[PDB]
């Protein structure tokens, strides 16, 4: 009697990994593209969609008031791999058809007065960069893995935030970090949205806030599982998760709003 | 050999709790005043001290680059309890000797053009607010308990991020929140400083980093332990700790610098 | 054994020059930061500290009731050298680490609604004034020497209290004089402090009272001795010393408290 | 043939004792009454008269700009001896033909709305207090040793500045101190005056300034001579002299004008 469309990225494991769907709610997973359409149509009633998806449809959609995937500073999962200073960037490859990553990239390039050519294309950052592209935008787990594959290994000495930004000629620019450099504020990448008319049941909300307590309470357990199926050290994933802001607090709402005004001028009002 | 002076505050438990000192280093504790002096005089080589303590001695002291006690938004343990609204404040009680809290309060008041009289008084927020005081400034565990006392109790449906700021006619103004409304940046309350002429052994830094991973990796465990000792629900302490920023990243030193300029004009350069 | 941390500033020569330590009491010296720390730490039991140092620790420290380093009117050693009128000051250099002078300068600036930026710099008043700074703050012997360098020389015909306040387009603003024009009271720069839990031995006090008596009784002598190592006329040094108030009397305590209220709101009560 | 009329009591010893009159000047000593009359009539060209004498004749007289007999707080030689609290006071003996003393006493008594009967009588504070007077006003050297005879003796451990105010049922009220409690400012008891049109020769001013330098530089030596004559401990005369402000600086002129306004409303402009 109530569907939900999750997009199980690593960055959301502290919330979804222990969730217990209450009586009356079902869940199904897939890719951003999938869930988005599902939410708008009705194949699903609630989903974790990108900030851009939510902003573009704020007219008919509402977001939970205390759930988000945000950060202040590096995110490590929204990376632009390039082999030449940004200003010299001429051709960029956009992977996994992400409107979120692109929207944020355009805002950043725009402010810098840049305008390289962007093209849909698939492959690893290293592949595409060896196939004519100056830069390659990547998001999600693959973005995290490839980031690590370039910089690091992360040795017992000196923290993860002590890793270089370049490796084997490739330079990894964190878009969330760029946003901080630009606004000094956090950036919100995703939220939980539902149609203003069809709000979720209380049970689901409590069930979710409880799973989150568990996830945040045992990051070492959450990290290990995923680090293993990601082929990454536990500490990398643990730090990666610790770094996320999940309660859509004022600082997150501020960043979300700053971005919404720059990428979707005249967007309906953002409600929660 | 290398002597460390720790002050086991609740907010640094995730870092010190599982700390195993390397061979050749020992640790003692005491009150801040005593611990800061010891560092400055040479009785101790490294200690966790307040931002203001570090700032005022940035010429003989340096701070570990990846360690801090900061927050973005509310901190919950640096509160100004008051009956009338802020602009009406005429008398403010100062619970204890805390250069850090008053320094931040003064910066906030000065900014708003206000200038209520500040007096050292003895007691709790409730009692002092009933003995002729418009506002009472409290810090630490007492501040956290009294905040939860005025607000809350918390329930399965609610989130701590959703608690009201007033109860029984008592408003609780979070100074860290105020600092965000003002600067939009995070605030750094403490750092790990050492005399420049005596850098810490690499072995100690690695031991500290391993201890922080453990604490961050097991928040539920660090939380239960200190919650009972504080008379607070595990979840209150858990979110409390999750809320802290421990790696002194660019956004944290940005806030630190801003505060520095406002509270200690002409301070020596902050070096890490 | 009772230990003392003396810092032989010129203005204390009348007191410490001929001090004969009682048996069972030793004495060391060093830089202010070092001695203040040692005192609060427990390494030193009594020391001649600045008024700010005392005020900021009035809860743990107490001061001898009849010993001070205060002045009514000019002090000649806490000078703000500037080329443009005070209201036009945009950036002031701080020749050294001195919480005292900075604290006094800030109370005076806030009072006049002025807020120039304060930066730590290195060098003489004239060199720094010829490198972008509108004003330079100097304390101690260098301040005295530079003041004489600017407004001097002095002749048999005229008195020291008659020297102009300008020379070569440089105006020397005496901070103690600014304090008088503002409050009409004396200013207390330093006191003799000890930890409340460890009062000094009567034999030391008596030795001190006796030593001051000798210095005050032979000012020409104390002066002739320091006015040589300082490169100054005996008369400049004699008047400089004669001009100090050493008994921490009612008027001096009045000034001290007025300053403590402004510079250190909420400071602990000053006890003697 | 410039004539001088010195009123030579202990408080001016540091200045006159080693005075060396240049060619063309002579000096005649005597009592206030003689000297004042002598200055006014034309016998003497310059004399160190009381502040009241100067103010009341400010129309025809001018005073030296850097010479004075003033203090901040007690003066120890302008005392009101009494056997009952000031309010219950009802019979005060005026011990001399000094206007300086009664002027100050009356200004003070009126400020407290007190109005005991005042009448001229001759004798020591103790004899007159035993001859039907509950109050006796004394000034000068006798005032100093009768104060000591009451509140003394002085012990090596205790300081003069901490000597009691009462003795054998006799309270000594220091009028300079009363002035401080009333204005927070210094009091000027005397200046060096001369008829406006008959200024003193340069050689005399330089002779005076040099003598002052010598006296202030050797207080112990100056104190002994006078202590013996007065039958007082050397340290008493020494603190007494050390306590005097001799340069007629701004703080002293403020106190002078303050007094002038109260005691001689509408007085002529004081000129130097």
Author numbering:
A (entry chain A), B (entry chain B), C (entry chain C), D (entry chain D): 16 to 287
Manuscript text:
The final refined model of 10093b contains 8 protomers, 18 sulfate ions, and 653 water molecules. In the 10093b dimer, Glu172 from the atypical Val166-Ser177 loop makes one of the six hydrogen bonds present in the dimer interface while three other residues in the same loop contribute to van der Waals interactions. We suggest that the atypical loop found in 10093b may help support dimerization. The binding pocket of 10093b superposes well with that of nitrate-binding protein.
The Pfam protein family DUF178 (ID: PF02621) consists of 61 proteins of unknown function, 59 from bacteria and 2 from archaebacteria. The structure determination of 10093b and 10093f has revealed the unexpected similarity between DUF178 and DUF191 family of proteins suggesting that the information from three-dimensional structures along with the sequence information will predict the family of proteins of similar functions more reliably.
